[model samples]
Target chain A: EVQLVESGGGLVQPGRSLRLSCSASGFTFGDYAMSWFRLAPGKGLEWVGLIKSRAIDGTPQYAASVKGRFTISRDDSNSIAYLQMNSLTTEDTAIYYCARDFYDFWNEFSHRTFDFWGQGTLVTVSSASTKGPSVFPLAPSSKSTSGGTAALGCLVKDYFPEPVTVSWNSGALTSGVHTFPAVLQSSGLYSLSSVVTVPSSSLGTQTYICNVNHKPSNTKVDKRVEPK
Target chain B: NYAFLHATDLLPACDGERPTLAFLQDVMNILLQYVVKSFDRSTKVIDFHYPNELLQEYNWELADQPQNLEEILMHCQTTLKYAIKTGHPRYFNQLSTGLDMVGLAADWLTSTANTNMFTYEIAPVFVLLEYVTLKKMREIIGWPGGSGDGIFSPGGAISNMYAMMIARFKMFPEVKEKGMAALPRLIAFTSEHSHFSLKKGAAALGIGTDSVILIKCDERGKMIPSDLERRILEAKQKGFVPFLVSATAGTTVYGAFDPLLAVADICKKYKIWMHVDAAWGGGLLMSRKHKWKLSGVERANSVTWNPHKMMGVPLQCSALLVREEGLMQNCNQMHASYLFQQDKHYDLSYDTGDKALQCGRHVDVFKLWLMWRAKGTTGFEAHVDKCLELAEYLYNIIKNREGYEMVFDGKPQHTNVCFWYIPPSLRTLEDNEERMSRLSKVAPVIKARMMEYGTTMVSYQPLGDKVNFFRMVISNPAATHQDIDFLIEEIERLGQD
Candidate 1:
């Protein structure tokens, strides 16, 4: 019987580093080469290439396609082979597998199929907020005019602050405004796009601007626009 | 062209460094004669065991010990005579089968050159070959400007891993040197029915297999977008950053297709990198009619396609195509001052190895290119269509048969047809669950017996809740309706009490 021994799991924040191993036993190191394959958490088998112990004139059968990041190294004292890949991206979060080499370019009896595989490890990245200062708006004057209505658009940076609200001003606006959720990026960054529609009459008479409130910051708004 | 094409169809009777026209002609005759003599029409040309005693008696060590071309030729003739013919019509044990004449010839030409495809200094001819073949694949994948970079990986799994690497590099260029810690706590999503490579890729990248979120799949084995969204939300709640989602074109166990279009929408919403594992079904891209089955495949950031899997090419041919041209190069490139000289006179030499994650790539593109030219687009389309048709024929026959039961409820998406035969001995014990367990064991036992008998060969495996069902794949071009019937009859005869 064959066996594939792999390392355990860990988690780190964005920009944290990690590495794992898939060591094997029950087979002679000289008899067979070790190869690595991948199967994403719940995905199919992907055959990475093999590393041979037997050399043709001292040159091993290294898969030319994986020469760089996928290095095949071995320890003679322990009879273990290593397939090391560097750098950890969010996309790199998948299971790594190891198998014995089964064939060469012209070996008819070779069992190229990966009959044995290793259990996988799980790595996760962290989420952190960006650091910056805050901005707010000044007080507004409610000056009414005939047939006046208003419309505005609000952009929110973060939606976590409690009692978060959005408000509008007919003239120059101050703090204490309305708010909503922000769209999130894969990397955990957030931005929100808000659109407010108003009628022609409102555009003609009153100036319209919008703002929002969060814990550390108050309502932030842009200058209202008036049609000519 | 006229002289070569219309030559006496005999050896040119001239000596050259390469295997001259005469030598090839002689080999061809020997190959043809062997095929004619060995083929078994009744059971479809399968040699049960090609006389193992004869094989053992013939010393292969002698061939390697040859001193001259004549001795080598003699050894070659003897080895060819004794070699078990995998290309025979009846051989159907593995996905890679068939000794395609055109493909074999192309292999010969490639071996003669003995050129590495890493750089142009040693392989100017192959640089162009790689470019042309990759462009053709890109065109097939719907890149209009042919604007993408692809490298022929050793197999489909590594090619898929290449896609994952490129996606990672595209998002975080620093990971190549700085390592996985420089990025956010990332999570990748794939259907439970997707390939195992996704989990392995996660582990290899140091992300750990647990970080891979297995979104639920539907009855048809397609990744349900709603379930995927739920998983993404759950991962976020747990504070894991979801980054990549892999969609399958044709699942291995059942040949089911995940809903690529639906998966694409989720990827867009999550801002996740989308990679399509189409290593098995990507060949459908050549078909004008079946291309729609892979709708929205173009939206994927990368794809894995293997000609050897379904195109009847020889062993070791697969490619990873990225929509963005330089992402693969950027992600995997490690500038070695001595090995890759930047100031080489031939720029092509500097070009190939720089882009690949590997340093010395085999010239795998040759046979594929040769096959493409020989078959043309139309021929490949027809071949794909024919294979699918044969699969349908097998599926339909097995579906309602007395002893057979289909593993999946619906029709297959590719040549994969999953079924299990209920032997006569188990017919009376059908009501017993324990008996069913024993019946499940029968397939493997019979399979082992069949191997020993040296009659025919097929593969079987468990799929999720199912157990020991046959996953008969029909990628072999030589398989026919009669061969399918023979396989069925043989299974029944062997399984009957």
Candidate 2:
């Protein structure tokens, strides 16, 4: 008896603001609550937030994963609900959906299922980065050893967005090699660390080099460790 | 000039590490090239080389001296060139088709790790990975949170075999110590349409194939619950113990699921162990729309799910999930101190591999775990939904069309679309033995043409009174609606002869 028509989808850059709308029809739109859900490109469905309907001033509740970055609001006169997202990133690139939740916000927080859903709208946030990371060899080899094993660490910091391939100078390290996923710093850049572990005896003859390739700018930064 | 041709340069111990990287990169290039060509509609699924032709063309004999790396590399090319590309979109020969990239990468990692999952001492990451994976698997099976225990076996057959062994032991504890001599005549029940593995497992376990009764199945190939109950009761009145009832969630040829809720009721009333062989259709559990087809599967005492088949993980991945946690361990464990040492550096509880029938088990769980992490549960759901939709698309096409007769009516519950392509010549023939015999030849002729041209492949065989009909199953995510059209068109064109 009701339909949810969702709108607002486009390609946006990082650190941009966006708003999505879900218009209701065929029924009293103010009677049923509205919710926003998203399905990432290859991931699972996630509940973004929801707004209660039927009330003159309905309170809104959101999933903790979205934090305070998302706000849900509705206009009774227009019979439409709106979802506003701030600082959109590549992670936010998903098919945003709007659905009618009959008894969602009032019941147990996470226990709601939508009866009617929108066709879903897709948003693609560009992850291409113009700025590149600066790389440095951790001073003094910072030896962490067990049973004569030592690790050489390289710190790669301050790159916006991601996809920086780190390889080794010492024979294409795979096993015993550890690299962390990119972590975004509060300064609006990214950081990553890579470490290669080898026997203490082999360190003298083996030259360890860390090569970081940020393909966008062809930004190549590499360092070699001189064992004493 | 030597590059990777010289054996001396292949070792990573040498400086520059360039040759090791170079050879691996070249190998990766070959694999990726083959992978793309596998999906190319223009490329043949196989080169269609005969056995002797291939043997005569290439020298496959082992040598005392090492061959040049160029020759070794050429071997890889020729071998795959002549081989059937199961990953091909049109390679619809079997239930397990298509190549999963994440699962393939996990397979490479499994081979690179190169350790048996005998103990945590041997494989730390793999041990916990199996535990974490099976815990969630059981959870998905509607078991309470981490409430049941499970192990990844070699394949569905082995998992089904394990289910039989544990069920027998649970009924009579003395069977483990005293063998079949101490027990009465034990019986097992399964639909005639169920996989041959049930009888195969019974034979291997010394239960004798005579004792394993074949129950009747409906026209759609689902097990008849009344037929099952009659046999069980008859066996019980004849002083035989009906220890197990192996229900088929998805029959092999027809893709039928037995009435599980009804079967479970029978098992419950009789106090027998109910095992569900959901090897092929197990991925439906992940599909919200299709999971209802296997209703009341959670009521089983044990369940076998093969991610390799439905979920598209790499080969040789199946789990035997048990409701009773320690039943499998006590049933199978011999407590060999050499492998299962009580005193270990890490948590001894993690050394749960001794619970398995085999001392050394391959780490098949990593591929499943990594693939799940890469694609999440939703990705699998998408594949299931897509494949089923493609299946429905085919069913809709041939349902009302000329020169095609469906084996059974209605849309298939699984992705299997069983039908016979009646060549134009045999379209108006009388319904007699000659017509039946001629009808059977149509699929075989078309099937032969598909293989000879290396264009596409599917399975065809006779079942009961039915003549040869094509069992068209859709599991490959690479297959599109266009591919389905091609399959139909190709069948008609090839069978026109």
Candidate 3:
């Protein structure tokens, strides 16, 4: 019953340092090791490094790409692990997660396959010029219109610091909402769309608002449309 | 050659001196142990490490202060402990595989020599070795009387660049001094299925990436010769000079070979320079049975061949062979008096540095030379045939097997076998957009699981409009039928859900 929770990540300027913490609980902190992973928005996971709380002479093994730029450390007393990345670049903007490892029989070998994972902490490195995503409502296609329901699409384009949340106004349609995975464009920006099916009885006169929340800036934009 | 020196004599004698004999012996033992472990099937391909966990488990830091000999030795052990064994029999992720002991020994001897390959004076033996090797390669490529010009380049990409440059030099030699402005809308042709290096070469040569017209490839990934002829005629009508046509002997992902004979015929009709990029499949030339894949390679004006990929030579060894002797010399000769002096003792024909684009090139010839010496010409043919057989074995196992789908039909041209493992839930679904979309994510998820399990390793990538699929390549001679069976079992075990 090992638990890990990640926090303390936010917008960081280029050349500035950012530190993330992963608090551990529900297990003997010093018994096993902790590791951090970096996941860019569209790119797959990259193993950063790992640290152990009890070993004083231990030096974390980092990926060759992040070797010198990142430092992994742990606090046994506080039962916490830390990742400090220095000389940050835009490429360093990623979601960082800390995970705990499981050991083989006899406890002689500890495999790095993470059994328990912390919620990813988003860290963005950009100038102050970063802005929220542009949101619009695409026309519902013919297939979207069925006998008693109509599907609505909310298109969010050109967003940075990729993490974004798209939600519809009507709570009645919450269960029916389906958000497509965000697509990373060649311009280093992200585009995403969300579809929600509403009853035809509530279509023409009802105004549905699509709310897009940009995680980095804590900014929100809304687009309202009525299906005819 | 210091033949009198013993193994221990190479190290420092004193205990207090840096790298004492005992310490050197210990470090060498550690490396030797790792090398043996690399071939051991019981050892994991990689001892997995999470970021912070590895720091807690091992000492991986560098200190400004001096460390003792024992500590340095421990560091060496730890480094090998965590590194991926690319030579592992089950490791089929990359095009390069199989650790050849002969090549390894040659590499060690090469490092011991520690000489640059820029001139014959500095590397007399190595320079001659390269010359003979290139001549043999040209003969294998069907050049008349083994008469041709070629050089050992860093890799396939650079070799392709040499082909582009040589073609430009042959077509419009004036562009050498005057640059692209002297040429009129110079265009190059390569199949859409060809290696990306052609486009990269075009951009790097100032020919403009747009100037690289991608001729259409058939469903099997071979270039459609009719489409190529149409494009050449269309380019000419538009007043564009189509100078070079690059045909791939082995494409990157599909392992498809372009129709070299058909493409060469079009190039001849259009008066375009023909180049064959056989970086991946060039090993087939050694296979008497499969050399037909590159039948018309003799007609190629220039050819890029890489022994690193299929020949199992260590990385960074590629040859760019031009059919015309002295063509490279005329195209790239800077005549740097400081290096390539006109008045040198001994036959100047031995001096080859002037014809190369690079100065102080790495000695990549020795490993291949040693490999060829150890394993005769027939040995390589057997190796090539075996790899193709392994690929065929995989194709046969998965072709009719339920829950497995191949990306393309027909026998593979080389060792690449691309397929997707359909999970239980998606097996019954019709091939609609919904089913296709759901199936696309299956490979990545299973791939993640495979890495976690560490039983086997394979690569997955989306090719063109196709979704992510497993691309299992067999270049490692160490790989067996059992390994192939294990790979299939592991994929099914992890992906079955």
Can you rank all candidates by lDDT, best first?
2, 3, 1
lDDT against true structure, model 2:
0.78
TM-score of each: 0.61, 0.66, 0.66
Clashes of 3: 10
Among incorrect, acceptable, medium and high, the docking class of model 3 is incorrect
User: 2 or 3, which is superior by lDDT?
Assistant: 2
DockQ-based class of model 1: incorrect
Prediction 3 global C-alpha lDDT: 0.77
Q: Compute the lDDT of residue B294 as modeled in candidate 1.
A: 89
If the candidates were sorted by their TM-score against the true structure, best first, what order would they fall in? Answer: 2, 3, 1
Model 2 chain B weakest lDDT span, ten residues long: B1-10
Which structure among the candidates has the greatest lDDT?
Answer: 2
iRMSD for each candidate structure, in the order shown: 19.7, 29.1, 26.1
Model 2 C-alpha lDDT per residue in residues B1-497, reported as the tens digit of each score: 44246666577566537777877787788899888777777777765556788788779999887778788777888777877666777888889888888888889999988998877777878888988999998888888896887888999888988888888888887977799888888888877766778768888999876567677666777877776787778778877888998888888888888889999989989888999888887888998877878789879889999888888888778898899877866888775667656666765665574676787887778888888898999999998999888988888888868987778656787888888788878887777533664676677778778888987888888764366888988887878888888888887787664
Per-residue lDDT over B268-358 for candidate 3, one digit per residue giving the tens place of the 0 to 100 score: 8889998888888788899887676677887888888888987889888888888887887778876556766667876566667567677
Off by over 4 Å in 3: A1-228, B1-23, B50-67
Candidate 2, residue B370: lDDT: 86
What does the lDDT read for residue B261 in candidate 2?
Answer: 94
| Tens digits of per-residue lDDT for model 1, B8-107 | 3324434342445555666678777766554544333333454666668655554332254444456667876656656566666777766788998799
**Model 2 ranges off by over 4 Å:** A1-228, B1-9, B12-16
